[PDB]
Amino acid sequence: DAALKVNVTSAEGLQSVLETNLGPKGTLKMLVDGAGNIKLTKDGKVLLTEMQIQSPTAVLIARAAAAQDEITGDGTTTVVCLVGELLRQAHRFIQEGVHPRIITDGFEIARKESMKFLDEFKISKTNLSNDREFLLQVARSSLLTKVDADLTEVLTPIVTDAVLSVYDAQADNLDLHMVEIMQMQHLSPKDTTFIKGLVLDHGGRHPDMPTRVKNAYVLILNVSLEYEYSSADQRDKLAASERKFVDAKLKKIIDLKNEVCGMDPDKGFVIINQKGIDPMSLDVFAKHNILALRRAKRRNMERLQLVTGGEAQNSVEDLSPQILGFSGLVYQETIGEEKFTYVTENTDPKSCTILIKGSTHYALAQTKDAVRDGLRAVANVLKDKNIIPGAGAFYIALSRYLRSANMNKLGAKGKTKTGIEAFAEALLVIPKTLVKNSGFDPLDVLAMVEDELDDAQDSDETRYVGVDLNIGDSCDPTIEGIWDSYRVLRNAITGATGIASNLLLCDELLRAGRS
Amino acid sequence: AALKVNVTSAEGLQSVLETNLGPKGTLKMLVDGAGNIKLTKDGKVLLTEMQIQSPTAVLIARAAAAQDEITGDGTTTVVCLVGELLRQAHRFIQEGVHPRIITDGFEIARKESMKFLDEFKISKTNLSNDREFLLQVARSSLLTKVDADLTEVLTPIVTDAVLSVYDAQADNLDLHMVEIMQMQHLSPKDTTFIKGLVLDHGGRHPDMPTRVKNAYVLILFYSSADQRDKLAASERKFVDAKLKKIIDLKNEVCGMDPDKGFVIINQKGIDPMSLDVFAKHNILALRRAKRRNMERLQLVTGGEAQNSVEDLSPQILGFSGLVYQETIGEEKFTYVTENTDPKSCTILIKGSTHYALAQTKDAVRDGLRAVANVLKDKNIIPGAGAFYIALSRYLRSANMNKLGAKGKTKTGIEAFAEALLVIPKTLVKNSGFDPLDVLAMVEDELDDAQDSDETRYVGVDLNIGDSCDPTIEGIWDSYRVLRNAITGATGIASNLLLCDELLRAGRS
Amino acid sequence: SQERTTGRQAQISNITAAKAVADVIRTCLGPKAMLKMLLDPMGGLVLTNDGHAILREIDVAHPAAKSMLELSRTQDEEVGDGTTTVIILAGEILAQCAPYLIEKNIHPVIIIQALKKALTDALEVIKQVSKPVDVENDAAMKKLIQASIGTKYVIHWSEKMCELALDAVKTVRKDLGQTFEIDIKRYVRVEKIPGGDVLDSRVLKGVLLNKDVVHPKMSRHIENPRVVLILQIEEEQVQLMCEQILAVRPTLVITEKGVSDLAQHYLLKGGCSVLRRVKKSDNNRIARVTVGTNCGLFKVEMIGDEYFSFLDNCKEPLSGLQKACTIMLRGGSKDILNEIDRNLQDAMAVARNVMLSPSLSPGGGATEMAVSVKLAEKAKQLEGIQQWPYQAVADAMECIPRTLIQNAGGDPIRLLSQLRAKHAQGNFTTGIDGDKGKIVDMVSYGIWEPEVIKQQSVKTAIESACLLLRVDDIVSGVRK
Amino acid sequence: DGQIIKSIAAIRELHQMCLTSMGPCGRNKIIVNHLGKIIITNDAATMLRELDIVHPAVKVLVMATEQQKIDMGDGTNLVMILAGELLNVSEKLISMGLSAVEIIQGYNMARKFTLKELDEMVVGEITDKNDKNELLKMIKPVISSKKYGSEDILSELVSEAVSHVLPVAQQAGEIPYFNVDSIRVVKIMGGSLSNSTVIKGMVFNREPEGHVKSLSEDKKHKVAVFTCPLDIANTETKGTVLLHNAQEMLDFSKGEEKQIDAMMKEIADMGVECIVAGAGVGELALHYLNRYGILVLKVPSKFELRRLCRVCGATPLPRLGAPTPEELGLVETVKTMEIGGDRVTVFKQEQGEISRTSTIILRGATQNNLDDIERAIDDGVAAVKGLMKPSGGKLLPGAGATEIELISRITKYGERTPGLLQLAIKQFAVAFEVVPRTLAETAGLDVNEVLPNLYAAHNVTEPGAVKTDHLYKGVDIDGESDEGVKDIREENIYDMLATKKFAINVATEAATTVLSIDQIIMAKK
Fold first, then answer.
1. Strand (E) or helix (H) holding C348
2. D224: which DSSP letter?
3. Could you give a GO molecular-function term held by this entry (chain D)?
4. How far is B324 from chain D (nearest CA, A)?
5. Which residues are registered as beta bridge partners of D520?
């Protein structure tokens, strides 16, 4: 077993990577590649992508975050933090002669006992009443773990009002219902504004396009609009026939538009194509008050059905009034080389569009990664009504029940007890990291928390004691409002147990292959 | 920044002497460039000539200097404590604890260790010179060095050797009995103790007395070629004047009847003609005899050490009860036995090879010094790691008893208690058993002893991996063994803990 | 060879020379200070808190840092007392001259003008916070030695250790009747023999001769041991010396070599005890006191290693000058005896500075805070071109107690904010506690130092910065 | 697995070399030292002496083998293979998980048990003391360890050498210790085995002084051994000749001649038959020496003079004076006879008395083969030592037959010792199985045929008949290799009890030292 400590020592250095990115008071780490992409974020998926690694064991750490991205997506630093404390305890208890699987079997018993106490620690809340005080407090703790306090106060009502749009009496939450986020460079990043309607990412490419309209009629196209001898007389007929294919479709647009009402062209009309546009069609679109586009996207067209009931048409054969929608008010803004169209005053929009403005790419990359990670975390809160008090209150409280067991849960003498004391003290590294990132002493703060829990337990009163990193004192997660979803913590402890058994059960490192 | 450099690098120093602890431990081969093979569990030899990597091993090797004049055996506890201390830095200090915070907890625990040291010791009566207690202490003392074969042989040897040195004031000095014969003869188990004095030289002539009772010990430009022989004739008269005076002066008591034993001892070479003139009077002389060994002859027959041949008095010549001479190899040995009141004894070690004597030479020097502290200080501490396990439990639960700074000292208190538990676990690991199951049984024996309202000391039996009694088994340590060790245990700990930063630089 | 630096490169290289070393010595301040490890060319290491050997073994590639060792030797020869709280001040100046030097394009001579004015106002502050105490009381000096020995456990033995040196302090003194209590303690040598106990040390007022007599069982009493400044050869020649001294009829004998058998006949007929050869340096000890007369009593003791001889004048005059004596130090072990010598040998300079300036300046970071406030007060009054450089000097004295706070690892802003009120306004005895890292009374807690400690240091430290501001070009690699 | 294991591979290289060097069927080797010393022998003891020792256990084996040469020296590779076999068995015991301490306890408890089993195999209890005839028969099988080509001729050379040195003194004569260094063999190139002779005196190879040694036929002479060598008279310190005038210039050469006339005539006044001169002398000495017929020994060595004192029986005079009639040796005949082409001065006498310290002239064609015979003489006289200084060495069955009975005794001891001793003791008897396989491997026989023959004799049982054939039968190969059994009583091949008695203590000591090594530490080497 001479190679047993090889993988343990090499994997120990993986803790300092995300150690500073954990917690609301955590800091940022810069990672820049050679392609010109500057990514500054606390997210581990981006930091572990292009960064070169030495110990191959870091690959399994990235695979453990795959299940955390779907269930949580934010706050995944605690996955590697529990491994780093285990690696420091690895060479400690294994050196005593205990077989590594014995410690692994102790984690399975501690995991089953943790789920038993998991239901007693959580507080069931009602999501039907749509409590604003509960949503503002949970979203506040999530924003501080990603961006600073400047964007926290701005995005707090934004995330709160966004999750209230998607809900029903059956608790049906579709993550793919509200997705599209508007990426724009305008003013400053702190000016991000929430919109309950739908936003279009393209606008008129010609000076004669409609500047301001009220009722817009959207015509969606996909297939490419741009089209590509005995005497020179045939050369003139072939070039003249190239425009007959486009002009044949332009004559149909003129008659079908004026069909319903052709008297006053004071309303909006829009033609959207995926590929380039024929410049010959702009002459017809200008006199007919038709808005045209050049190099427009596709997936953004499916959002017209969820609000105004629009339809995204592919070919030019099918044209129906169902394709043409309606809008209460349209405000078109010109930013850069591409004008931007806003659709407001919707009857009953079922999806909200996130409009994010900023300065440059790295300024937008911080907010773009925060909204996608912050929205999916809050969306899972409304899925399960069971809510777990956060701020690391469960990790410290569960350890108190694990440290004292004796006749309750014992099993083998010293074989299971080694894993019990290991897992009980392995969860205490998280509150020590939260205080270390804030710059205070983690032991002096933890000593006051243990003294507070001893006074609350001896007094026979139910209370949850957290840690306030701003003033460096103890607090109550209920008073401060820090909460956690049930599926977040349950799959985090279960996910940490599965990934822990991979490194502990590895007996030896082997090198075999062709050089 | 560089504080963690000396903590991680020096951590691998514990495995050096880790397996050298315990009577059931193993041995390590050390061969230098001069061809000297030293195979022993002793730490003085292993920490001296062996090359070191981390510079921190310099203070570790120098820390055993105080243990050489006091203990010399079981010095691996110095290294085992440092190794566990550095692993505690990766746990407690890694949390951000200042290195001096944990240091102050060890200095306070040093005074608490001395208070609990006097309660754990057991007092004995050394005035009666009880051999039954000395046979048990020397027994277990040799088990940590040699096997049971050399233990049973050397147990009565060391026991009877320290009894010859004694007085009404119980004065025992290691500088009194020093010289120990080292020779390869027969087998190591054939070592024989002599209550008298042993001489390393004997009669070189067939007419020399083989066995006698009484022995008188005498301790010691020319113009032509013909003129050159006058100087050679005068130089011979110089040594002749020394030999001719001996023939007349030995006639003092009886020179006519050569029926008794005669002895002449000289430091330098002597005229070989002495063998011819001394054969008539049956006088014995030696060739290349030592000097310092002559000072012990004054403590038996009441003689006097003499340098030159000019001054010779009857007070120099003593009366011996019996004199025996044994011929071994090319060097005969003269044994002086049946002494009236011998004040000293000579240790004669017999062995086969050089490495066979290396194990015995290290055992005798460390054995005589360990027994010396037993007679000097009557307080004898039970061994077999009984104090390290008990003291760990005494300081584990303190609270309102001894606390100090709240949370700063308690972190260091738990480190000192868990550091002493490595020694009994090392004893079990060297035996090949499970230290988790053995320690769990030892902790239950101490809990059953304290709950029974009876003071008991429970040891660790490495043969069956169970608990035992150091009193019945015979394992015992002197009070000065743990007195200087625990006092030094705090000094060796404060060296690296108070160490701040080491920089790479110097004058090329 | 050139190695010349001009323009902005000359100032940057010289500041960073001692700047990196200043951060290394930050752990050498206070009773909580760490212990630095050294690396010699031979691979060995020396673990000690004394910064004198630290800067000597460490080889700095920049020659500008070599003067700091020479500047440290000046403070060690003049004071050399409590280097833990003293010698660190040598590197607290250049580190604070970094923020504005080149950035404001201020010429170094302009900074030199502010350096000369800072020394004038600093001398008035040293004697302003000092307070007089009784100079004849030996109990006040007992607690003073106990303050600098807190790096070890010798506090338990401090009762014998403090009285060991203080008995020699009051024994010497007296180089002048009036104008100042000059003395020389170099004549008193401390011998360190491993083994035994500290209580074996014999010290009192008089001249201690460390040697033995003729025979250990010889009479231990002499009425008036008046002091006066192979076999065949030794008995004839030595007799012509010891017996010749008897012409003035002294009862005490002092020889270079031992006494033979023939001399014992005429030496013992005088009705007293005969003293054989005396140590060479012991003759210089009695030469200060005294053909000497008025010797009260003689005594001899016996112990295995070496023996003792007691010689008590008990009356120097009939004015006079200082007395010299001897001290033997017996430690518990070999490694313990050599390490504790730093605190006991420096105890000579501890009480020597008390005789110089009986006034006492507050210690434990209180002196540096008092100077930092006075320098900040005179900055706004002077204004002029000195406004910027003379204000940074006040911040230089403020960073010295920040180093003491670094041992605790807290926030100096919280402590220094309260020290700008309770100290400046309240009293000069306010300072930072070393053990608890809090603000307590220095005099009540027992932390104080003589005025000479702060006077001869800060004045030397300010004058030591002159060589740092005069640097222009560096020339090396030629010859000398 | 990198120390206690790999250390066996270092000895395994030397262990395989000892398998082919053991027994009369063993193979020889060629050794070339780093200084140019060439050694060809079948004994691995001399091989390990000149070979550079790297692995620490190699020095452990050569020192344990050197202890045998001081005591026994007969078949030292027997314990070396046994010690090397314990390392091969150690790989089986370590694989089972037995600790190094318990493995030593298995060998240590079996060591004291094996020493007690040596009393059950005792045969040939009684032996004669001063009888040479019975001694010549028991020394013959000792040669079988080395080259067995002629055991009769080597016994005749010892017969004439012992007959001179033997004090005889039948019944109780207070017989002293028989000196081994007295008998000294001299290698002479050329001649056959029968051409070798025995010299009662000291055989020297040098040039005679005046003409040739003669005149001793009438015997009745006196010879005195001189410890002080005869040389030109000089002081201890180096002097310089200082002449005060020119008259002393001609008297300097004449003054030295006066010393030659004074010194050489005074020493020749008594007419000593043979003078001992350790240093060089001038050519003017032939005047007085040849006049009185004095034989001169020119420049001997240091070790040959110590043996000369017991030949001539002369007192070792510490200084050189005139010969004293009180202390004189008795020498009768001194002659010089040509043997190998050069005149050989011999001190051999003819009857008249028996003195000690005889010599043997060894004549052979191959000088390399004479090295094995020279070592056979050292081991030949060592066989007499076991029957001389001790009360007796008795006898034990040879040809590995003694170790066969021990296999059954060790097996019975393992059944009575449960626990960890079951794997230690049962494998300890396996270490005795390599001895008969070594003799069968060097002989070229199949192990499959030898295995049932080893099981038949001592393993099966001992019938109730008195003096069973199993004890007197053993493994020997002449024409009977097909059957695999031979009677050792008719061939009279026996070994002394001291042979195996000292080997068992070495086998455990060699195993205890090596198996207890945790790691090898070398500083600047």
1. helix C347-356
2. B
3. ATP-dependent protein folding chaperone
4. 18
5. B29
Virtual CA dihedral for B204, B207, B208, B212, nearest 10 degrees? 150
Catalytic residue among C50, C76, C175, C312: C50
Q: Classify residue B258 as exposed, middle or buried by CB count within 10 Å of its CB (0-12, 13-18, 19+).
A: middle
Is C85 catalytic? The answer is no
Spacing of C-alpha C373 from chain mean position: 29
Starting at the earlier edge strand, list the strands of the sheet with A123-124: A123-124, A386-389, A483-485
CATH superfamily ID and name for D1-125+394-525: GroEL-like equatorial domain (1.10.560.10)
Technique that determined the structure = cryo-EM
**Phi/psi class of residue B427: alpha, beta or left (left: φ > 0; alpha: ψ in -120 to 50)?**
alpha
C50 is catalytic: yes
C-alpha distance from B178 to closest chain D C-alpha (Å): 29
Decide: B23 and B140 in contact? Cβ < 8 Å: yes
Task: Give which of B493, B484, B491, B488 is closest to B415, Cα–Cα.
Answer: B493
Q: Are C285 and C187 in contact (CB under 8 A)?
A: yes
Q: How far is CA D153 from CA A67, D43, D136, D162, in A?
A: 94, 22, 11, 14
* B305 Cα distance to chain centroid: 29
Strands A198-200 and C207-209: unpaired
Q: CA nearest A95: which of B14, B167, D437, C234?
A: B14
Cβ–Cβ under 8 Å, residues B265 and B217: yes
- 3-state class (DSSP) for residue A310: coil
Same structural domain, A363 and A339 = no
Q: What is the resolution of this structure in A?
A: 5.6
Test B407 with A447 for CB contact under 8 angstroms: yes
Max CA distance (Å), chain C: 88
Q: Is C346 a residue of the active site?
A: yes
Q: Is the separation of the CB atoms in C429 and C443 below 8 Å? A: yes
Domain count, chain A: 3
DSSP one-letter code for C436 = T
Phi-psi group of B261: left, alpha or beta (phi > 0 → left; psi -120 to 50 → alpha; rest → beta): beta
Contacts of A396 (CB under 8 A, 6+ apart): A427, A428, A431, A446, A449, A453, A465
Fold of D126-200+353-393: GROEL; domain 2 (3.30.260)
Neighbouring residues of D280: CB distance < 8 A, sequence distance ≥ 6: D231, D298, D299
Within 8 A by CB and 6+ apart from D232, the residues are D256, D282
Query: With an 8 Å Cβ cutoff, are B436 and A92 in contact?
Result: no
Range of the domain at A32: 1-125+386-515
Kindly list the residues from chain B whose CB atom is less than 8 angstroms away from the CB atom of residue C58: 503, 505
CA atoms within 13 A on the CB side of B174: 15
| Class of the CATH-defined domain D201-352 | alpha beta
Cα nearest neighbour of D99 on chain B: B432
Residues A35, A76 within the same domain = yes
If asked whether residues C46 and C117 sit together in one domain, one would say: yes
Nearest residue, CB atoms, A443 vs list B95, B425, B429: B95
Give the separation between CA D449 and CA D455, rounded to whole angstroms: 11
Domain residues for the domain of C8 are 1-133+359-480
C151 noted as active-site residue: no
Cβ atoms of B286 and B266 within 8 Å: the answer is yes
Reported for B308-316, long-range contacts at CB under 8 A and 24+ positions apart, including other chains, are B308/B220, B309/B220, B309/B242, B309/B245, B309/B246, B312/B218, B312/B245, B312/B249, B314/B252, B314/B253, B316/B217, B316/B218, B316/B219
CA pair distance B262, B272, nearest whole angstrom: 17
CA distances from residue C10 to C22, C64, C478, D362 in whole angstroms, order as listed:
19, 11, 19, 92
Range list of H helices, A11-131: 15-18, 44-47, 58-71, 77-93, 100-121
Distance from C-alpha of A209 to C-alpha of A289, rounded to nearest angstrom: 7
Give the angle subtended at the CA of C316 by the CAs of C312 and C320, to the nearest 5°: 150
Is residue C127 within 8 Å of C359, Cβ to Cβ? yes
